[PDB]
Design a binder for these strands. Structure first.
Ligand SMILES: NC[C@@H]1O[C@H](O[C@H]2[C@@H](O)[C@H](O[C@@H]3[C@@H](O)[C@H](N)C[C@H](N)[C@H]3O[C@H]3O[C@H](CO)[C@@H](O)[C@H](O)[C@H]3N)O[C@@H]2CO)[C@H](N)[C@@H](O)[C@@H]1O
Ligand SMILES: NC[C@@H]1O[C@H](O[C@H]2[C@@H](O)[C@H](O[C@@H]3[C@@H](O)[C@H](N)C[C@H](N)[C@H]3O[C@H]3O[C@H](CO)[C@@H](O)[C@H](O)[C@H]3N)O[C@@H]2CO)[C@H](N)[C@@H](O)[C@@H]1O
Ligand SMILES: [K+]
Ligand SMILES: [K+]
Ligand SMILES: [K+]
Ligand SMILES: [K+]
Ligand SMILES: [K+]
Ligand SMILES: [K+]
Ligand SMILES: [Mg+2]
Ligand SMILES: [Mg+2]
Ligand SMILES: [Mg+2]
Ligand SMILES: [Mg+2]
Ligand SMILES: [Mg+2]
Ligand SMILES: [Mg+2]
Ligand SMILES: [Mg+2]
Ligand SMILES: [Mg+2]
Ligand SMILES: [Mg+2]
Ligand SMILES: [Mg+2]
Ligand SMILES: [Mg+2]
Ligand SMILES: [Mg+2]
Ligand SMILES: [Mg+2]
Ligand SMILES: [Mg+2]
Ligand SMILES: [Mg+2]
Ligand SMILES: [Mg+2]
Ligand SMILES: [Mg+2]
Ligand SMILES: [Mg+2]
Ligand SMILES: [Mg+2]
Ligand SMILES: [Mg+2]
Ligand SMILES: [Mg+2]
Ligand SMILES: [Mg+2]
Ligand SMILES: [Mg+2]
Ligand SMILES: [Mg+2]
Ligand SMILES: [Mg+2]
Ligand SMILES: [Mg+2]
Ligand SMILES: [Mg+2]
Ligand SMILES: [Mg+2]
Ligand SMILES: [Mg+2]
Ligand SMILES: [Mg+2]
Ligand SMILES: [Mg+2]
Ligand SMILES: [Mg+2]
Ligand SMILES: [Mg+2]
Ligand SMILES: [Mg+2]
Ligand SMILES: [Mg+2]
Ligand SMILES: [Mg+2]
Ligand SMILES: [Mg+2]
Ligand SMILES: [Mg+2]
Ligand SMILES: [Mg+2]
Ligand SMILES: [Mg+2]
Ligand SMILES: [Mg+2]
Ligand SMILES: [Mg+2]
Ligand SMILES: [Mg+2]
Ligand SMILES: [Mg+2]
Ligand SMILES: [Mg+2]
Ligand SMILES: [Mg+2]
Ligand SMILES: [Mg+2]
Ligand SMILES: [Mg+2]
Ligand SMILES: [Mg+2]
Ligand SMILES: [Mg+2]
Ligand SMILES: [Mg+2]
Ligand SMILES: [Mg+2]
Lengths: 101, 73, 88, 119
RNA sequence: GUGGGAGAGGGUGGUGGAAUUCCCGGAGUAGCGGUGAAAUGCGCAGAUACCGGGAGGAACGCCGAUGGCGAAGGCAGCCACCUGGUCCACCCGUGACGCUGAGGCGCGAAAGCGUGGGGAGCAAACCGGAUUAGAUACCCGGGUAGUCCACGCCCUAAACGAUGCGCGCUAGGUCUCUGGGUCUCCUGGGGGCCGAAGCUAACGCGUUAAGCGCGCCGCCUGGGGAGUACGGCCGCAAGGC
């Protein structure tokens, strides 16, 4: 059981319905792999530095979770299935390292 | 010798390991998309070494450029 | 990996008395744990040699400690072997 | 016959030859020139002067499409790069900007023996 | 043992962007390329230069260093899992359990071999163009094995610090990586430079010893013949000891 962070970037052109369905699938899969959600941040659409999937912007989701390590990789797979989901990056959480303090 | 400005001293309290904060990291990138050297960033070995991996992370997420085109010249 | 709870389990298990972390029995026990875990790791990933070196070093240390026990107190030696199930 | 009137100027320069391509803002080309278009044949194409002639010929060809302002794009490290720049600078064409786009790999491909002792 | 740290140490899966080549579409015209100068070559079946989309293979730009890790070979995009080594603080535990190490066993760059796959760029052999007295070369245009993956062999090297491993002792100055502390500084581990005593044929070495000592292993005994011949062992062969 380790504490991770799930970054998900998906299609900015989605209407509220399709988007809701996507987040629904995310939550669903998360429950399937048994990841407790500690907190969440929805950053919305933002300007990318380079075009992703031909589209200049992207919609961001961030989930701080706790899940069994052994399935983490196996989880990412699922999240990458959706065509609407163009990026998935999972990171082991880390205590912030401050500079100029 | 880079006597113009040191990026660290030009900034306040901030987290180096945080990959989601662009408005800071962007200051650590050159005119081109390249990661600035120790002379310019004014960091230390440890700091710079962490900032490197975080910047790369930000690049993969699409927040930071891999490369840019040089203006003027 | 090897979590603290497991380690305290085997330590408290083999300890000659309460509060003993350093006995030959304890050491041989810990080493046997690590060795078994590593071998199970090298059934898969058999192309990873750098770790196999570590396995050789651990095996060596265990054999030396066990040798020491065998010299000092053959009873405790046979006991340790029996509870651990080493030597094949 | 288009009448674009605003466009892009691509300078491709190497130690061997300099070649200029003028395009619309979509990137599609209109006209082009090079040291070969002018009477120069051999090594003389890698000249600053060859470059000047090239950029000027491309400019003149592109005036006939009635163009005025261009963005210059520089690629390659070669002789007659800055000279082709200066040529376009006042050809009568207004130079809106200059940008070096020269492709640098992240080290994908092994170079020819000529370019090696690097990666 | 407890608590902390740094790291391109290793293995498996996934993944990102730049570039090269090929393909498709748009636009566009007479050359591109390459050299000391050229030609072969490619181009009117529309090349080069430019924009858009797609496929595939290989390597990871800046960070990056006089840096870090590893026993050595060696290791560099990013993420996750599995996993080795190691350092510091606390003085907690066992109680000489140590050091070296013939033989053995394992690892071992590149090239090379077997089977299957892959093949973008580069490129032995080879096909050509130049140069030259000749040019079985240097330079130029092509190009097969190979370079890439998996599994199995091969065991070589300027496999280098041309310096076996471990422990103790013998001025300091300075730079640096990485811990801890009363954080001007002290203390510990690693990487560099100049230098005390001392050593060395000299160059140089000098708390990272090539100094002062002890233990154990390996090796040398004038040059060519020759790492050859024979024998044995190993190898599918090349060939190795
Ligand atoms: N190992 C790969 C690297 O691990 C890094 O993290 C590594 C280190 O930072 C971390 O250090 C650990 C930690 O518990 C703490 N600092 C002390 C501890 N002794 C260390 O554990 C160490 O020893 C054990 C055997 O006892 C090994 O199994 C382990 O690999 C080694 N790191 O253990 C991690 C695994 O070795 C980063 N994830 C990244 O650089 C990379 O993935
Ligand atoms: N690809 C990631 C790496 O794969 C390694 O091994 C992998 C690759 O070496 C091997 O080949 C893969 C495969 O998908 C298929 N044959 C083609 C594919 N392009 C390759 O993957 C890789 O190829 C090369 C490195 O060889 C990289 O340059 C490239 O980015 C990457 N796609 O396939 C293996 C897995 O199927 C190791 N697991 C580790 O280094 C790392 O995870
Ligand atoms: K011709
Ligand atoms: K080094
Ligand atoms: K400190
Ligand atoms: K002397
Ligand atoms: K010297
Ligand atoms: K040998
Ligand atoms: Mg997808
Ligand atoms: Mg030892
Ligand atoms: Mg030329
Ligand atoms: Mg590593
Ligand atoms: Mg075409
Ligand atoms: Mg050609
Ligand atoms: Mg051809
Ligand atoms: Mg022809
Ligand atoms: Mg025709
Ligand atoms: Mg082309
Ligand atoms: Mg393209
Ligand atoms: Mg292909
Ligand atoms: Mg470098
Ligand atoms: Mg070293
Ligand atoms: Mg005590
Ligand atoms: Mg006692
Ligand atoms: Mg030994
Ligand atoms: Mg031996
Ligand atoms: Mg080998
Ligand atoms: Mg090989
Ligand atoms: Mg083969
Ligand atoms: Mg084959
Ligand atoms: Mg070629
Ligand atoms: Mg060739
Ligand atoms: Mg020839
Ligand atoms: Mg001659
Ligand atoms: Mg063959
Ligand atoms: Mg051998
Ligand atoms: Mg050397
Ligand atoms: Mg030295
Ligand atoms: Mg060394
Ligand atoms: Mg030494
Ligand atoms: Mg030895
Ligand atoms: Mg040696
Ligand atoms: Mg030792
Ligand atoms: Mg030592
Ligand atoms: Mg020191
Ligand atoms: Mg080193
Ligand atoms: Mg000296
Ligand atoms: Mg003296
Ligand atoms: Mg002297
Ligand atoms: Mg050494
Ligand atoms: Mg010594
Ligand atoms: Mg010898
Ligand atoms: Mg010998
Ligand atoms: Mg003789
Ligand atoms: Mg000889
Ligand atoms: Mg020989
Ligand atoms: Mg023989
Ligand atoms: Mg035989
Ligand atoms: Mg032969
Ligand atoms: Mg031969």
């Amino acid at each position: 059981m380790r504490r991770y962070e799930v970054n998900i970037v998906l299609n900015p052109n989605l209407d509220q319905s399709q988007l809701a369905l996507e987040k629904e699938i995310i939550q669903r899969a998360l429950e399937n792999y048994g990841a407790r959600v500690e907190k969440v941040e929805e950053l919305g659409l933002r300007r990318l530095a380079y075009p992703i999937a031909k589209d200049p912007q992207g919609y961001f989701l961030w989930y701080q979770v706790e899940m069994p390590e052994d399935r983490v990789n196996d989880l990412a797979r699922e999240l990458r299935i959706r065509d609407n989901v163009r990026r998935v990056m999972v990171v082991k959480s880390q205590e912030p390292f401050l500079a100029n303090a | 010798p880079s006597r113009k400005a040191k990026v660290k001293a030009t900034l306040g309290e901030f987290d180096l390991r945080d990959y989601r904060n662009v408005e800071v990291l962007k200051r650590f990138l050159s005119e081109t998309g390249k990661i600035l050297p120790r002379r310019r960033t004014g960091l230390s070995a440890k700091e710079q070494r962490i900032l490197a991996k975080t910047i790369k992370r930000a690049r993969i997420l699409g927040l930071l450029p891999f490369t840019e085109k040089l203006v003027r010249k | 990996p090897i979590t603290k709870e497991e380690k305290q389990k085997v330590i408290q298990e083999f300890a000659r008395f309460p509060g003993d972390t350093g006995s030959t029995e304890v050491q041989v026990a810990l080493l046997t744990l690590r060795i078994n875990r590593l071998s199970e790791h090298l059934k898969v990933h058999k192309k990873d040699h750098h770790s196999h070196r570590g396995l050789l070093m651990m095996v060596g240390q265990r054999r030396r400690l066990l040798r020491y026990l065998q010299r000092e107190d053959p009873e405790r030696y046979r006991a340790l072997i029996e509870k651990l199930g080493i030597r094949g | 016959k288009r009448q674009v009137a605003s466009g892009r100027a691509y300078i491709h320069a190497s130690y061997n030859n300099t070649i200029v391509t003028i395009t619309d803002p979509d990137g599609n080309p209109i006209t082009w020139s090079s040291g070969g278009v002018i009477g120069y044949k051999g090594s003389r194409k890698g000249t600053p002067y060859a470059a000047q002639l090239a950029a000027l010929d491309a400019a003149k060809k592109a005036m006939a499409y009635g163009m005025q302002s261009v963005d210059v794009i520089v690629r390659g490290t070669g002789a007659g790069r800055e000279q082709a720049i200066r040529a376009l600078q006042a050809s009568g064409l207004q130079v809106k900007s200059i940008v070096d786009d020269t492709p640098v790999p992240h080290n994908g491909c092994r170079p020819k023996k000529k370019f090696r002792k690097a990666s």
